Amino acid sequence: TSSGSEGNVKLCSLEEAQRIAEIYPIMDKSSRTRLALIICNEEFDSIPRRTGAEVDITGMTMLLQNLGYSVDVKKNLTASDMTTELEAFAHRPEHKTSDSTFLVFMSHGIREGICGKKHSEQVPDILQLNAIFNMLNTKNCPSLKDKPKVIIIQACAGDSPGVVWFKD
């Protein structure tokens, strides 16, 4: 049923769970404090508005909650603000009593990385993927050591359509 906490996510039954040393351990449902962060940039200074971003926010937020994660949603941030927010998210004590995390980044994008709210071709405002990993690794985020860190990115990686032609 969709009225439950897992909503539209198909449930894994007890017989299915037993059928599945090579798996990441899952914490007790009663005591665990699962955390997830979504950063979505809709309104920008120079780059056109990202219409339909609210559908993506709603969708991902509901899904991550369905999988048992408490979801933090932050909107329209510069690359500096994202760095600050990611640093703040890494320091959250709930991670210690969590078995995993989910990071979601949604924005306009270029080859170098994800665009902040103030990005322009003259004055770039870019968050590199390399910076995300660095803030969430064992050195800067010891609480998520040995725990799966899933990063989801909705953005362009450049300008190319990504296609080539071939004949039959």
Binding site: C12, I26, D56, G59, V150, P161, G162
Partner: protein, 88 residues
């Protein structure tokens, strides 16, 4: 006593398109990759690990149309299979 640990481990990144290439977003229906991921997570979280779910997402993009993109898994240091075990 202190022990050594890998600085970077147990990471997985899933991007909406390959390097140099665009990702698509419907102005009212939302992003293609995001909607596709949710659909696949809802269906396959129960029976598949995240690496396999992500592969299935890539497969759903296999036949390109007017708006084409190929989602990419990047910088994987998962040493185990990550099952979400939804409902538990």
């Amino acid at each position: 006593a202190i022990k050594k640990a890998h600085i970077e481990k147990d990471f997985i990144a899933f991007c909406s398109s390959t390097p140099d290439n665009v990702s698509w977003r419907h102005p009212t229906m939302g992003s293609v990759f995001i909607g596709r991921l949710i659909e696949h997570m809802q269906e396959y979280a129960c029976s598949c690990d995240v690496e396999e779910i992500f592969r299935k997402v890539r497969f759903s993009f296999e036949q390109p149309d007017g708006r084409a993109q190929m989602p990419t898994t990047e910088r994987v240091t998962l040493t185990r299979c990550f099952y979400l075990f939804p409902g538990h």
